[PDB]
UniProtKB/Swiss-Prot annotation:
The gene is L. One of its GO terms (biological process) is DNA-templated transcription. Classified as His(+) endonuclease since it has a histidine upstream of the active site that coordinates the first cation. This is RNA-directed RNA polymerase L. CDD domains: PDDEXK_RNA_polymerase-like. Belongs to the Bunyavirales RNA polymerase family. It comes from Bunyavirus La Crosse. It is found in: Host Golgi apparatus; Host endoplasmic reticulum; Host endoplasmic reticulum-Golgi intermediate compartment; Virion. Residues 2-186 are annotated as: Endonuclease. Changing D93A: Complete loss of nuclease activity. Mn(2+) 1 binds at H35, D80, D93, Y94. RNA-dependent RNA polymerase, which is responsible for the replication and transcription of the viral RNA genome using antigenomic RNA as an intermediate. During transcription, synthesizes subgenomic RNAs and assures their capping by a cap-snatching mechanism, which involves the endonuclease activity cleaving the host capped pre-mRNAs. These short capped RNAs are then used as primers for viral transcription. The 3'-end of subgenomic mRNAs molecules are not polyadenylated. During replication, the polymerase binds the 5' and 3' vRNA extremities at distinct sites.
Amino acid sequence: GMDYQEYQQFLARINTARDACVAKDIDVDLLMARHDYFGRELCKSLNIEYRNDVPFIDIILDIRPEVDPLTIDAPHITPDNYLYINNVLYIIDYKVSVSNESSVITYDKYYELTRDISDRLSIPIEIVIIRIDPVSRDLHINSDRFKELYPTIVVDINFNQFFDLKQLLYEKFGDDEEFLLKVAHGDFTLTAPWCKTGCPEFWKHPIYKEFKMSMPVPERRLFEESVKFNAYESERWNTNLVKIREYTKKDYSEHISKSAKNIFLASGFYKQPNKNEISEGWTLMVERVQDQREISKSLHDQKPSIHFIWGAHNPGNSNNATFKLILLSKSLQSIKGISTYTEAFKSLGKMMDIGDKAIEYEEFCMSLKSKARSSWKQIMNKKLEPKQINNALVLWEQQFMINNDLIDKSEKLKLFKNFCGIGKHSKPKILDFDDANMYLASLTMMEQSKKILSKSNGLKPDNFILNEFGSRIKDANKETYDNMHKIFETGYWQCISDFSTLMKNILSVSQYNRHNTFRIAMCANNNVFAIVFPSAATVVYSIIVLHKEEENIFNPGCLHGTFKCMNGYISISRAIRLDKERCQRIVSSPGLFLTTCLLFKHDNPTLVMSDIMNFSIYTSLSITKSVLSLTEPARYMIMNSLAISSNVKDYIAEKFSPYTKTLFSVYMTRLIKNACFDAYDQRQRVQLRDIYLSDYDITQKGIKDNRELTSIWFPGSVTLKEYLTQIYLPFYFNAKGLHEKHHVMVDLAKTILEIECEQRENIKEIWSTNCTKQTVNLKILIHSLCKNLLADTSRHNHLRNRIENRNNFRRSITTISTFTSSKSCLKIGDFRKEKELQSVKQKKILEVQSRKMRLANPMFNYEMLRNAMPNYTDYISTKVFDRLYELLDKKVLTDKPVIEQIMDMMIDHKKFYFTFFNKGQKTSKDREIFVGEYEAKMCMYAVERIAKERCKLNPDEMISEPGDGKLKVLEQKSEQEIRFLVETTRQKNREIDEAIEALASNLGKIEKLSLGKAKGLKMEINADMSKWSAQDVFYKYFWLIALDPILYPQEKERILYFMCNYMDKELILPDELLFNLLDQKVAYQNDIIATMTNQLNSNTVLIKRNWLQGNFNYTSSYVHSCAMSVYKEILKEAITLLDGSILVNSLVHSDDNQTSITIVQDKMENDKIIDFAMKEFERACLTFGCQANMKKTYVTNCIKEFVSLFNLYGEPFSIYGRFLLTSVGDCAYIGPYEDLASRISSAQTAIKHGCPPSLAWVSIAISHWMTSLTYNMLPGQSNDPIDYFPAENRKDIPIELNGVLDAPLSMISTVGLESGNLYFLIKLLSKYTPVMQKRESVVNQIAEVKNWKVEDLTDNEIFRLKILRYLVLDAGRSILTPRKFTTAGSLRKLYSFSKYQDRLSSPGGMVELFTYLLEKPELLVTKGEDMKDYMESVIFRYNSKRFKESLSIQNPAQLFIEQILFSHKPVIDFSGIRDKYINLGKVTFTEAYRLLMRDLSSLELTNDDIQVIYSYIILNDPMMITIANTHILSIYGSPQRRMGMSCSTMPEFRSPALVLRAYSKNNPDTEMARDLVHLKEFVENTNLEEKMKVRIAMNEAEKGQRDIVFELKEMTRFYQVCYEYVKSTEHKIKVFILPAKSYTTTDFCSLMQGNLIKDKEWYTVHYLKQILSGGHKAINATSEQNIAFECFKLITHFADSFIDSLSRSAFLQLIIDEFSYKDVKVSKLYDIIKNGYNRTDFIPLLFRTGDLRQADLDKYDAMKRILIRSLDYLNNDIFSLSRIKVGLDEFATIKKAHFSKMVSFEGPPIKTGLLDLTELMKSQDLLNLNYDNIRNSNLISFSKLICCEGSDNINDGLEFLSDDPMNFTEGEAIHSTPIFNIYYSKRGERHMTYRNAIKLLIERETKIFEEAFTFSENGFISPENLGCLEAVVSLIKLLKTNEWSTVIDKCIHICLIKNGMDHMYHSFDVPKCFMGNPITRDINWVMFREFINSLPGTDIPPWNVMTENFKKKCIALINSKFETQRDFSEFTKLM
RNA sequence: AGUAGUGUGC
Ligand SMILES: [Zn+2]
């Protein structure tokens, strides 16, 4: 990026400097260094000459020197650069800054002065100031004339390297306040106050009394003093803040020492995990569980592991519906024996008989299905009636009627009372997992499963996934394709998939399942069936299977019993009562399952594939809560047990509680138990990779991947990365929303009331010194607040200004999202009236639904609560957008500034109320959400937001960093430590290491000195705080508001009052919880809920110290940061004692914490400091009121846990798996494209977090599978659109119609779904383009499109383009989307929806809205900027029936079934499809394909229509421009192993609602005026201004009068398509893990491309031309130049690196003339360099050719006193093209380029004795700049570099190679606790030249070739063998020159030239033996043939296989020559 | 029967 020379000198100046005024100048010099750097590279980007601080009076003299500068008055300014074209002078003053505030100042200053001579000379002078952003990198130019000149400018600039120097300078001097004084943009500017008057009540409040009670009396007054302090009044802002700092400095200075001095007190005794410590924990766990749960040893109490019973399919019987129905009927009737429900199952088969009348079932059912398939809506009013067939009364296809005559009254009861459990109505029941005869039973269940499921399907291993994605999986990694087959083949896959396909059909049936009906559900298996019994939503089902022989059935613990029938055996499973939410997951279980297996097995050959799948079905299908209780606690139980410092005992003895209800759970528990002990013995089995560090980051970082560790869930060995996956991944198998709300509300309530009681009874004291639970070290707090509050205001002065802007404090409440959102909200008051009326309605609807059930199968309160509970404070649920509307209409909210309204609300609202609703997430331990009043939301907003922008300043806080941005931060901080550790070790041990190499004589004396030295120590505290919210003093936060400098006194009074009320805040127990406790039935022994509510009197309990979970994150997080800031100071004083160095780095995120400590020792042992660090860690937490959970907290020597994002020893790594398990049931079930959109987004996310392409593609397959399974769009399904459309396969069917996503992953990762459309257009620009222009930019290939011929194209090719233009372009672009008939639902709670009723009811008032909205069309798309505007927007919104539904929650489970059932019904309205073709009702999916073709065939494809596609898609979006370029200019290079992974940021490829108001009326309300100009162009170029008006203007003559509906609906479309153009998208933080650091776009592109090709090897990427094009106005000049630079940089270095010094000019001269780099002649590139204005870059090149003149030297010398003859003399002994002396010791620079580019050279061969330097250029292996790599290289690699034309003495011929020394890589151990070797590049000695390397290679490798090709006991001598050699090398020329043969020839050649036998080799033709007659050149193939067989061969590596293949090839080939398949008639003609 | 459960439900 930047120059290396200036970096080194600026780094040294930071250490050299001591005083702040010296450090000041280093910051000033760094600005100019960046200033010129931007200018140097931009001048080449614009092709102009570079200049610096050139006077304006001289700039005119270049244009017109006839008038002298004295008489003509020119403005005396100092511009940077100038240009004169088109009779206009353009003045340049480039500058790099974040804001244009510094640019407009210099703009108007220049514009004013330049006008003095602008009218004097009558030549207009334009000011062109170019500014670039130093982080986001965006170009900003003010000149409009300059915009039209340069359409696109190349800006791949690097500031990343500049900020590295800034970090160093603001580290040493950043602590000193003398340096902070010098950096200022106003010193300190405090903005306008948010309030006018203070708060008197705050000083009176009893909580403020209680605050000062505990506090000491000097502190009491200080708090008074601090609040009343105004920062704007006193001379400086830090008057008070420093004053209170200096008071507490007595106790602080002492307490910092106190903690630090404990380093000597410590011992080598810390909570370390050990086999016994784990064992002890388990035993106390057993005791706990055996009390807390009812332990059972009986095998009848178990629950099903899986809720399914699979049995082998029967191919002998027919696979057809009607047949199976009767088959199961007779089968069920035929059941023989006696049980409980035997005669019940018997009659059920009897009630589904058809027999003779099989054909009547085929018709009757098809009529009913056809009746429903006609209508969009369901068939209402008409009564469904059954038809008597044999004994059964069929109601629908596979639906029957329960006939009360066919079953006994007693036998009907048995089935429903006992078996189905309809009418059945104290510890939990669990299985003893410590019983070996229970663990046995559990193991035998697995042994049983493996015995049956391992057996193959025997059916074709070809399903949609493999059929359509197999190709794209296989090419990524062939292993995974096979792995997939291995699964699909095995009964495992058929078992799950048939349960999936069966459940889909169980749900589909269960929807219309009545109370007098039992339904039958069949699957792809013709033995497996299911019976769905009447449900009293709840699905009641049994799996009924007809397995072959007895016990050829899989029972996981689900089966009721097997039964013998009259033909075979039939088994019926226990009645399962599951919920649709659970069942859904079972349907998507195969996708979950495949991923599980593939992820585990991936690239690990030691694992048993049949054992992975054996475990996987029991996970992917496990829907019980038994499993979650294992999967979650395991993650910590393993990691704790393999960490260094960690408390396992306590975690296993308290936090671990198995709920082993099922039988898999028992087996899985013991898998975990065992895995805990294996960890302890593997702690030291972890190794640390050899770190190849050579300045600016490291490649080959992180942990060593060694397969020495042991797996957890199955047998085999595993890698660390894989071990971690096996540890953490299990938890993501867990299922969401399993927690029954009835139980959650109780346990959530109980906990809050338990911890509040704790505080009420036990915790009384607030502050303390000894450090105790819920206590803060008040003196230490106040100081550490003061110190940080200073540094978080000194580093940014406008801090109060930044808060106002970024959080919209000044603007009206109606603008901020958090307030105008559709989130849940709590309303307080009295609703006893409507709450009673809303309840009794449902209590009647209860009886309504019961009355109807009494007729068919006779099986069978809010008033009470209010009457019973006296002190019941009444509340209600509402919406956040609705509350705002309510508070405005009743006028308490206004257009007053939101903060100004907040301040008043803090003092107005005095009592705060909060309610909780459960999340019920995948975790077994349930999480609560506290949601209270809207009034509260406003208060917390300010307090939290003020802390937000404060927290952002501190780099330690990470809640500030949105998205997965933390991952890179982990890395950047880990790398800083790995570097520091090395740097510091080399700085101390250098004195000792010198003596070691000196003596190494006797080695017995060396060990004495090698012991007594410095010792490295790294450690990471992977923390997790205990009860961050509940067990935390809220009183401490009062001080943060008090001490605050950027808060006014009248604000400070008001903030603290609200917080004073947030102590007397009440928790409302929601009614649903109170209803559970309403019906007593004997109360709880010790009822905590009743205790706190006084035997249930009030529904409110007061919560004090427990500030509610998530309400004060940032606030608490700043105090956390302040706490860890102390921990730093503690250790940093402790390590100065021992005399060494320490680097502590703390990452803070509310409750999740990570703190990395790196120490270089001298005195005491490493293990002492380990215990010391942990002591002060808890101390640091507890001195601030927070307590650290030592249970979950673990410490490693590498690993970093932080928010579950993991960084290893530099190498960042997340659990790629967790995101692949999302693409299964994560969608809103809207449409085929709409579903896939989010399912592929989940796959895109995996790639970010370092996922292999092979597995990435799997998710893409699964996603498609589920997507197509939802709407019956799979191959062979109903809506299968391959026959309906013209196409070969689903790759060619548009993804809008649902097909497959045919694109490269490197595109899908970037854009996705749209990629599939983009690839179909790039395919064309690689088919329908000529030989010229195709190799050039994409832009050029788009110009040729309008010169194509339409007739050339094919049916499919035409088909895409027609939809792509007439449909896709304008309409998340979908065409097919099913519409529903859903109802609005109950919207009574809403106030705002009532005001729509009143405006709809009263006549005229409706139209009045729409007529008002037409004069303000800004309020159709965006919400109002003012009260009325926002309010009336809310009412209009209700117009949409979709927005009315949006505020109601539909179950995705129910939504899923509704898209299956409504697929054969008319759902897609064609009206909205045909409208576009023209500019009936709903249409069925099948008909939608037909009716699309009837319209499509009519449309016309032109040479223009196609050119609109290539404009609107490619040429419009600068991103799509580059993506297409990257895939056309792509040149994939060297395949390499993924050694070093690094984090990389996604690059850039680039007023809202107020602008649209200035479009409605052209007058705005200055910068916003300029924004409308480009908006005018957008609407005029597309011409959508007229197109919209014409569409309305001709509709009023179509309809008749004035339709207000069309007046708006068409006007809204016009404003919504504006929104996307006007309101710009925020470039959110996206981090991709790549094989190296991506600085700029091009770098990112190359590394991204190469990461998503193969799994085993990543590839480095090249490009012919620049890929970064900006549009279709910008059509090469800037793409050419850089090629010339690359070329000559490459050549000069290749020449001075490898070619002999003596003959380097000749080489260059030969290369320049007859050669070409990247299809451009090197001469033309040289001419481009010579005609350029940066010749100073290529001084040594120009001198060597004789194209260097004095002007260049004079310029070069002026950039950073010379003569030509001086150079001519000086460089008489320096022979290099990359370097010439331009002084006494100053050499010239050529700037080295990478050597992976030399392949892009194409010229005639240059032969040098024997070597062909062209082939050395074209070589891959022999281009490394490492001596050892080339010395220890293969002869196969070198054998390409030989021609020799009969040379001699190989030693002589190698004279044309560099006899200059090469660079070797040396490595050394670092002497850390995690001991690793650093490897770096040295310069070797002298005898390490390129020649000697080649020679040593030749010698070593030829010796091995000789002994392999002896074929006798002689050698490479003895003509008896030379004859054999001649024979073997003869055939090689008379056969076929493939690739294997030629190598042998050239190797033999080499070997014979070496031995001095190259005076005959060239005169070696076929011997006399083989040649019958010498003259008559006849060949005896038979002889030759038998000669090849008669060759013995050798088995020495590496030639053993080489020779073997050669022989076979040559034999086969020879035999081929003979074998000529002649025509049968041919010979019959000749003779 | 199942699902939930050292909080009494479906
Ligand atoms: Zn030769």
